[PDB]
Amino acid sequence: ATRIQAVYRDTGVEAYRDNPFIEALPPLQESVNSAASLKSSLQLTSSDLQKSRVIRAHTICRIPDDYFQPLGTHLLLSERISVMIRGGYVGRNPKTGDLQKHLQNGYERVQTGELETFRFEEARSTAQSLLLIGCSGSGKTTSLHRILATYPQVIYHRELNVEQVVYLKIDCSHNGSLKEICLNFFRALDRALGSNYERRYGLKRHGIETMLALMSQIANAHALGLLVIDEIQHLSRSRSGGSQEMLNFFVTMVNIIGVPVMLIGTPKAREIFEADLRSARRGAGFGAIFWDPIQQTQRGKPNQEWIAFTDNLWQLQLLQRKDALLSDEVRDVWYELSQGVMDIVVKLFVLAQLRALALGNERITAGLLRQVYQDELKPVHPMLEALRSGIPERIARYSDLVVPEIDKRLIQLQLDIAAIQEQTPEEKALQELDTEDQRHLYLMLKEDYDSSLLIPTIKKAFSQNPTMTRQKLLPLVLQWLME
Amino acid sequence: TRIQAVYRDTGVEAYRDNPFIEALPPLQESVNSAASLKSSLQLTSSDLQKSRVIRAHTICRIPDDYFQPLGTHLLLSERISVMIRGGYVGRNPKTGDLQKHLQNGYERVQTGELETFRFEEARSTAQSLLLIGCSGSGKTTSLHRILATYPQVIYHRELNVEQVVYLKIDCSHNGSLKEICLNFFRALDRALGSNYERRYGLKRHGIETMLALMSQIANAHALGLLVIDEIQHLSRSRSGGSQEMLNFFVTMVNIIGVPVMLIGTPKAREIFEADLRSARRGAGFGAIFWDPIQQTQRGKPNQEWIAFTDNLWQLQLLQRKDALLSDEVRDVWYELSQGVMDIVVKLFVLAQLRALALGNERITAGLLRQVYQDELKPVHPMLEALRSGIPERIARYSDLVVPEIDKRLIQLQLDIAAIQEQTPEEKALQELDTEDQRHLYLMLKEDYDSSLLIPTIKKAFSQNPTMTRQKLLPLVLQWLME
Amino acid sequence: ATRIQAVYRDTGVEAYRDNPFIEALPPLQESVNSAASLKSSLQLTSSDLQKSRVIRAHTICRIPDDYFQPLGTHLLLSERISVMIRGGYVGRNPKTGDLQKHLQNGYERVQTGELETFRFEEARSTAQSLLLIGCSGSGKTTSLHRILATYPQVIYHRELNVEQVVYLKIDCSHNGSLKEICLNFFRALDRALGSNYERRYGLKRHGIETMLALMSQIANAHALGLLVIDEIQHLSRSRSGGSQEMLNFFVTMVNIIGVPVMLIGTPKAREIFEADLRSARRGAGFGAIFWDPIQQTQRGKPNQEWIAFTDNLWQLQLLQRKDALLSDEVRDVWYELSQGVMDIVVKLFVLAQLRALALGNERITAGLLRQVYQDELKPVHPMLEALRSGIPERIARYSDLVVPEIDKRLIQLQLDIAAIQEQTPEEKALQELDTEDQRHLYLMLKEDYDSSLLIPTIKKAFSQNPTMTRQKLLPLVLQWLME
Amino acid sequence: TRIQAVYRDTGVEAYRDNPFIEALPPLQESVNSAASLKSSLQLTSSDLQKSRVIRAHTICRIPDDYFQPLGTHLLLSERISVMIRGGYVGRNPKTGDLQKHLQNGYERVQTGELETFRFEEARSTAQSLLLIGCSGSGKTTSLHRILATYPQVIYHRELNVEQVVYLKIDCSHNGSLKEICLNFFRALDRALGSNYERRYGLKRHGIETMLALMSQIANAHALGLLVIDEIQHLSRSRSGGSQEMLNFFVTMVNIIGVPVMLIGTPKAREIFEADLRSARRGAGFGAIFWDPIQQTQRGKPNQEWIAFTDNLWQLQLLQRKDALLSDEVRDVWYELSQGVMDIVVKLFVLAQLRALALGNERITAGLLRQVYQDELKPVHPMLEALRSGIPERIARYSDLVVPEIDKRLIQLQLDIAAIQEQTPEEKALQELDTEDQRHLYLMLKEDYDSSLLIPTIKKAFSQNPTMTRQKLLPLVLQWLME
Ligand SMILES: Nc1ncnc2c1ncn2[C@@H]1O[C@H](COP(=O)(O)OP(=O)(O)O)[C@@H](O)[C@H]1O
Ligand SMILES: Nc1ncnc2c1ncn2[C@@H]1O[C@H](COP(=O)(O)OP(=O)(O)O)[C@@H](O)[C@H]1O
Ligand SMILES: Nc1ncnc2c1ncn2[C@@H]1O[C@H](COP(=O)(O)OP(=O)(O)O)[C@@H](O)[C@H]1O
Ligand SMILES: Nc1ncnc2c1ncn2[C@@H]1O[C@H](COP(=O)(O)OP(=O)(O)O)[C@@H](O)[C@H]1O
Ligand SMILES: [Mg+2]
Ligand SMILES: [Mg+2]
Ligand SMILES: [Mg+2]
Ligand SMILES: [Mg+2]
């Protein structure tokens, strides 16, 4: 409930002027670069690399939750959501009379008076329902959260008495029911504002059509902008009924409420929406946007998106014996291991580096990734192979597997790794030099020259000179390597 | 669309006192009938300087909001107005009480004073029309915009009837009569608020029962016009017989009045009208035939083509655009698109999108040829047939359409957003040809800002042809210091 | 649409203290005189007598609409409806919390603390749903139409953007249906509010439950005072469905909406609700105020109501040969002629003057009333004798009977009055005499003797002194006559 | 009425950790619970001057708001509380996972370590109470207020259950079993929001099937009590005979727990208890016999009657009233009403209304005798049997009820409303008695105002009696000009 006083900006577009619902929203000019400025990545330094192994493991355990790199389609989705929100208030101007009054006074103007022609049906071209479809585990939900967290949920109005709910979310659970969607809407609406609509209308006595009609009444009462329905895949097909009647329910849901609606679903939901999507008849709506995994070869050349993302992710590792450069084959092996799917790309790193922290040397190679895939990605094999196969039915039918119990596995492996006593060559050198952490400089020195000469000579140098500047150490240690 | 009715007089003799006709918009000449359909986009001058994604979206919005009234729409508008206003004469609701007049005439004819009388006359005002034209010539967006002037639902206070002016049905994908019959109900229950589909559209009823049952609903609401489009699909299917389906379309006369308009590709005409009793009912009010625009009328350039192309060209969104359209661009446009209406605009839209993608920011004939060779693969035989000039061969290739064209428009928008990503840092960050010094430059990034450090390693290999790397690591700092 | 800004009077009763909805209503301190001020009547003078017979016919035809004399039951109905209207807003207090918050707070206080006892009885609806059963032709509809129109319909508030609809009127028609009442409520709300609720809520697709569900929402949104369903007698039982399920439907209407509701009917409709009426159960409610015709006698003496109405109605006669005093024989006869039913008593007197203006002498006789009775009370012969019988079944069977189309018959009475040739001697006397305010003396003293000498004597005096007031004229015309 | 649940500890050991008991209002001692029930009208100090109708309405409202506790109510409250909070120990929803405990007990019994173990405990029968007393003694008004403290629908959020604490069933006049069975569903889906009647109470099932479905429905929701009122209509009606009437109430053991309560008139005892297996189920938790109060207790006056009458006496609303009650009026009440509590308040209300009607404006013995002899006729045999005291004679007439009392009250209200008022100018018309007076009045209105007109008319007759109207006029006008 981020209630703010309704401050009225001025919109350059003449169509959106004078509506208390549109000008209360954030301005368009400052939000142009906000979509591309939404990137968030962990700031790492050799200080964090210096810490103990268990602290490093804890730090690298939280990679898949605080990392985000925007892609090309991530801006198209933002633009579509913005135009969907700001194109759906032209009909609900509170100060000006409703649409029917406009139609009636226009029709009396054309009869006698002076008005040559009137266009009665004004097409709702700017705003339409969207039927987001993409393979499970591609990044649909998190991108939606980070796009939609920019708009404040509640903007209270004082001159009028209306509560403006800019957006809303509905989340379906496992094997849910049709009435459970309406109950989820009621619960989320009560959560957002503080109302008690469940007490008044949440009784199971009424039918589903009553829920729909009362939902329309509530959505007309409050200024409602967007209605997002999430994870259509989880709806059970047994107790629900026919796919035809589920499609009829969704079509009726789109029309009755009167505000734009956004649906998210698996490619198996395309089977449900086969009938309504084939038809090109106007008024059906349901424009489709296809999320796809990152492709490599476009115009015969490797893509820039994958290279940039791979470098930016590879910069986020904490290993003593890593390799700075990235080989073409090293990239390729886990490319065809992962097939480009977004969710398992970070999973492969967060499993492989963690496993290498206990298997031995702290380096990444093709064999390590192959072993990790073969011994820790057991369920997701057929979908990953079918994506290479390319048969649309094979891809569609065997999707929607989510390889559960990942975080528990990460914590169990973390505690297993923490249960250890074996030494490593470099920690006794760290404790040998000092606890003052001049190992920050030692790392810049040790990679090029043998430690058996540096450690005594840097100890003598630090005895005669209490602490050399980090810039000035390398020339003088060069002098001792030159003597 | 519940528009209340207010009456206005009409000068026509036969429509003097009729509560259905007088509630419609007044009669208009050809000055405005073929001029009110015009629409165009705004494109203020301040919209040229914006992000590339917004411009791509605005370009993609073009084909839905552009309509140029040609020299043919006036005839269609006049025919539609005449057919709508000429089917209400036989269904006058406000009738002077005929009981007393009929009885008085009855006594006068029984006593011998009056030798003749007209007691009652049935309805004889059912006429149809067919409209066929080549695919992509715009037979549907030239009908929605014409019929968007008349409001659908009119409610009268004096009586208790609702006037459904027009209703549009589309044929299914496989082709049979029963889905048309049930889709009439499925398209009727949406304009009003009702539940006709579940109450009447049951499986027990046969086809003849549905046809005899449509009349009661078509008389309860004063239906004016019923347009059936995409009649193409019913040429050959599991309909039970071509002659049986033709018998259906001719026994659709028993529906009360309601003049109907049929729309189909030129493949429908020869197969579908091959008998006198059905041919005379298809062209009951003239069969309007359409054709693509011709470049040369009689050796003189047509003003229609010039005006349409110039008005389309004045709707361009590029940073580097030439204001005037050179003759070669128009000539190449007509050579590629070949005249059909739908391919004239698709070439322009795709050319603009691919010019945005390539970064040329200019439209040229070579780019149009490239797009026509690239994306319009399935339609080529139809264009070559129109180039040939053989009427039968053109009739054979007359139902070719681009598949998943809306899908391709999205895939061209995705590439736009990727290339726009460009930041000031990688004027020095994005070059890997400097050296492999980036192995150690990672620590050098935090040491100082690379005001000259990136040029320092850049000047390192320029100054030094070859040197051992292990000596370069401190000597780069020597170059950094000096 | 009397959108007056709410002026908040103060009422000394503790229950109505500081309620924004209640205070906007008119005050009740001298409403007894206001309730007794409903009386309305035409103004008639002696001038209208000398007009032509068509003008008198129009004047007589104007009497039924603009005559109203309050009786005993009107005061009781006014006070009861005032109690129902004003007691209906103690629950929906806008400034403080609603009912559910009060019950929850009471439960939380009785749980622990020292609030020993809390009563959960709450309000049954908010006032009893009165059922005003009475015989047709008694005058219910006009009584409500006048005593319910002294309250402004809409009180448009200022700080709260809500409309305080104070009363409403549903009305069924011949051969109605169960869903027709639900549709008509929505349709009639538009005329009171000016909106288009029928477009969004009046779809025929909705079931009977959804109509009531939406009615609950809209009745809670707009502060509603009353809901007067009228003419249940017109409904047909078999067309709607099960007759015994109508009582279930009406109980569901009373329970869900929550605002006070008052039905109207005839003893034919009583058998629908008789199951709840016989039981003294609290919660069934449906208290009945029985409407009965005027009784002639009280304690072995004529009832004062009958004579009080009779004299007042008898003062409106403008007969030319009329005597000042009403004779006792006709007083005895028309009660048994009409059984005291309120509607037809006035109708007999209306038709008597029209019949006497054409049949001959201008007076009132028992035979004239008998002749009118056989003329224009043919459809109501069975019900009148059923009332005479006194058996409840005979009265119940013959209820709902009304005379059709009396107004059209009045027009043909007037047309027949228009076409006549011969004239009365008094018509000759008024025509030949200069009847410009000189007529009054002649009329007031015409019946003393023959007017043959009177016609020139008044002229002699008037020409003797043209300038006189009638006040001084009367002694002189009286003095010259006796000579 | 969906009150959310907040728990509280209970001192009783057996009600340890069971939400159903602990979600209810806490225990109170009898005197407090039997003293918190009293209520009375406001009786504002200065509301003794008003219109007659408003005061008449206030007096008519008296019977619905006057309640006064007595001795038996505390015992009734204790029994009701014990029944409601003693039938919930068998059903404790909060149970730990009993699979492991039961299987471990089975293992230790099987291996020979243990010797005995109680696996599953099943409930047996149910408690029941019957409350019988002569009609009009307050067996329903004293039950709609004792049960008012307990909330009806408690909602558990941690679980998903609704606790329907109490439910009131009333048999109809027919007395058939299926009416009771369907009325249970009516009351239950009136308490909650549901449609149980259509889902279960169809015509298809027989009596045994609904009787068995009541158990499932009363275990799905946690019932606490079930009171059946007016059982006297099941004595000898068309319910299949007294044998099946006994068998149905005996077979009502199969309903799970839910201690039932039976209320009836003293005649129902003989019909309802004639077999040993049914009487011990009727009086399973006592058998309290109500009886009207008496003036004396043991050679001395009873204080409860004194308190009841004295407290009732102040509540009257009259212009001039004797606040200090005279003992003669109390003796008159005990002579007429004889003790039954229904008649005591009705006599007072009717006497007050008739006192306002007559204008005597005082409550005295004569008015009480007149109203008792006029109105309360049918109740006479019961009172005359009460005077004698013979058990068979009093048992013969313990079912009589006065009808049409509400209609009589409404007609009395109309009578006192129709008093109206007489202005002095209007009264002047009534002053004129001879018909000639009124005739001369009617002729002589227009010229003269009535105030001066009536006196000179009256002296005209007081001076000269036998002299005619036309001869009267000159002398009247002679008086008038002067
Ligand atoms: N563009 C992205 N950049 C970085 N991480 C991403 C991106 N998209 C998805 N992820 C990662 O994928 C993980 C799971 O994605 P999720 O939203 O669950 O997809 P889905 O809902 O389809 O399973 C997230 O923890 C997130 O870190
Ligand atoms: N006069 C016109 N100007 C510009 N575009 C037009 C015109 N007429 C039709 N179109 C284009 O044609 C398309 C519609 O073609 P349509 O009528 O569906 O073909 P078909 O009748 O073969 O189905 C629209 O997208 C519209 O852009
Ligand atoms: N005080 C009165 N004076 C004259 N007419 C009355 C009076 N009260 C009622 N009426 C008559 O009652 C009639 C309307 O009541 P009625 O038709 O019985 O109601 P409903 O239509 O509900 O049966 C009117 O025609 C009116 O003449
Ligand atoms: N404690 C009481 N004090 C005063 N009046 C009472 C009391 N109990 C009952 N009454 C009166 O009894 C009437 C209801 O009687 P009821 O209980 O229905 O009789 P029964 O139990 O025979 O059906 C009420 O009008 C009420 O005034
Ligand atoms: Mg998801
Ligand atoms: Mg088409
Ligand atoms: Mg009526
Ligand atoms: Mg009782």
PDB file of C-alpha atoms in Angstrom, chain D residues 128-197:
ATOM      1  CA  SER D 128     -31.714 -35.420  26.251  1.00  0.00           C
ATOM      2  CA  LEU D 129     -33.949 -33.092  28.269  1.00  0.00           C
ATOM      3  CA  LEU D 130     -37.686 -32.381  28.174  1.00  0.00           C
ATOM      4  CA  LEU D 131     -39.268 -29.139  29.409  1.00  0.00           C
ATOM      5  CA  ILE D 132     -43.049 -29.216  29.875  1.00  0.00           C
ATOM      6  CA  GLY D 133     -45.404 -26.608  31.285  1.00  0.00           C
ATOM      7  CA  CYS D 134     -48.841 -25.141  30.760  1.00  0.00           C
ATOM      8  CA  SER D 135     -49.129 -23.046  27.614  1.00  0.00           C
ATOM      9  CA  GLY D 136     -48.387 -19.364  28.093  1.00  0.00           C
ATOM     10  CA  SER D 137     -45.765 -19.846  30.819  1.00  0.00           C
ATOM     11  CA  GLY D 138     -42.851 -18.649  28.678  1.00  0.00           C
ATOM     12  CA  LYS D 139     -41.154 -21.706  27.170  1.00  0.00           C
ATOM     13  CA  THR D 140     -39.980 -19.863  24.034  1.00  0.00           C
ATOM     14  CA  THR D 141     -39.330 -16.249  25.077  1.00  0.00           C
ATOM     15  CA  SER D 142     -37.213 -17.632  27.934  1.00  0.00           C
ATOM     16  CA  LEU D 143     -35.363 -19.757  25.359  1.00  0.00           C
ATOM     17  CA  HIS D 144     -34.722 -17.093  22.698  1.00  0.00           C
ATOM     18  CA  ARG D 145     -32.815 -15.060  25.313  1.00  0.00           C
ATOM     19  CA  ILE D 146     -30.844 -17.719  27.200  1.00  0.00           C
ATOM     20  CA  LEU D 147     -29.434 -18.925  23.864  1.00  0.00           C
ATOM     21  CA  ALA D 148     -28.769 -15.363  22.663  1.00  0.00           C
ATOM     22  CA  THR D 149     -25.409 -15.196  24.461  1.00  0.00           C
ATOM     23  CA  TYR D 150     -23.826 -18.015  22.452  1.00  0.00           C
ATOM     24  CA  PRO D 151     -22.732 -17.035  18.922  1.00  0.00           C
ATOM     25  CA  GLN D 152     -24.240 -19.183  16.202  1.00  0.00           C
ATOM     26  CA  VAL D 153     -21.560 -19.482  13.487  1.00  0.00           C
ATOM     27  CA  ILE D 154     -17.981 -19.570  14.780  1.00  0.00           C
ATOM     28  CA  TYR D 155     -15.310 -19.748  12.070  1.00  0.00           C
ATOM     29  CA  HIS D 156     -11.956 -21.490  12.501  1.00  0.00           C
ATOM     30  CA  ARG D 157      -9.176 -20.079  10.330  1.00  0.00           C
ATOM     31  CA  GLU D 158      -6.462 -22.561  11.341  1.00  0.00           C
ATOM     32  CA  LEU D 159      -8.827 -25.402  10.440  1.00  0.00           C
ATOM     33  CA  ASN D 160     -11.663 -25.238   7.881  1.00  0.00           C
ATOM     34  CA  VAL D 161     -14.856 -25.843   9.885  1.00  0.00           C
ATOM     35  CA  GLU D 162     -17.915 -23.887  11.003  1.00  0.00           C
ATOM     36  CA  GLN D 163     -19.345 -24.427  14.491  1.00  0.00           C
ATOM     37  CA  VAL D 164     -23.134 -24.187  14.286  1.00  0.00           C
ATOM     38  CA  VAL D 165     -23.710 -23.992  18.036  1.00  0.00           C
ATOM     39  CA  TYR D 166     -27.509 -23.992  18.305  1.00  0.00           C
ATOM     40  CA  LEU D 167     -30.356 -24.600  15.869  1.00  0.00           C
ATOM     41  CA  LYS D 168     -34.092 -24.200  16.502  1.00  0.00           C
ATOM     42  CA  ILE D 169     -36.686 -26.510  14.931  1.00  0.00           C
ATOM     43  CA  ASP D 170     -40.437 -25.965  15.265  1.00  0.00           C
ATOM     44  CA  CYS D 171     -42.947 -28.590  14.160  1.00  0.00           C
ATOM     45  CA  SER D 172     -45.927 -27.400  12.134  1.00  0.00           C
ATOM     46  CA  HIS D 173     -49.646 -27.973  12.721  1.00  0.00           C
ATOM     47  CA  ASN D 174     -49.855 -31.083  10.519  1.00  0.00           C
ATOM     48  CA  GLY D 175     -47.395 -33.046  12.648  1.00  0.00           C
ATOM     49  CA  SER D 176     -45.913 -35.290   9.954  1.00  0.00           C
ATOM     50  CA  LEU D 177     -42.348 -36.569  10.215  1.00  0.00           C
ATOM     51  CA  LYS D 178     -41.230 -35.480   6.739  1.00  0.00           C
ATOM     52  CA  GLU D 179     -42.123 -31.882   7.596  1.00  0.00           C
ATOM     53  CA  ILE D 180     -39.683 -32.046  10.528  1.00  0.00           C
ATOM     54  CA  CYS D 181     -37.028 -33.678   8.350  1.00  0.00           C
ATOM     55  CA  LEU D 182     -37.296 -30.970   5.688  1.00  0.00           C
ATOM     56  CA  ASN D 183     -37.559 -28.180   8.275  1.00  0.00           C
ATOM     57  CA  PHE D 184     -34.173 -29.267   9.624  1.00  0.00           C
ATOM     58  CA  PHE D 185     -32.654 -28.519   6.209  1.00  0.00           C
ATOM     59  CA  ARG D 186     -34.603 -25.250   5.992  1.00  0.00           C
ATOM     60  CA  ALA D 187     -33.251 -24.046   9.338  1.00  0.00           C
ATOM     61  CA  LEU D 188     -29.714 -25.222   8.596  1.00  0.00           C
ATOM     62  CA  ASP D 189     -29.360 -23.524   5.216  1.00  0.00           C
ATOM     63  CA  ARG D 190     -31.023 -20.445   6.691  1.00  0.00           C
ATOM     64  CA  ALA D 191     -28.346 -20.359   9.409  1.00  0.00           C
ATOM     65  CA  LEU D 192     -25.474 -20.614   6.918  1.00  0.00           C
ATOM     66  CA  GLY D 193     -25.500 -19.668   3.256  1.00  0.00           C
ATOM     67  CA  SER D 194     -26.182 -22.823   1.254  1.00  0.00           C
ATOM     68  CA  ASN D 195     -28.819 -24.863  -0.579  1.00  0.00           C
ATOM     69  CA  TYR D 196     -28.910 -28.124   1.392  1.00  0.00           C
ATOM     70  CA  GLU D 197     -32.636 -28.614   0.731  1.00  0.00           C
TER      71      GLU D 197
END
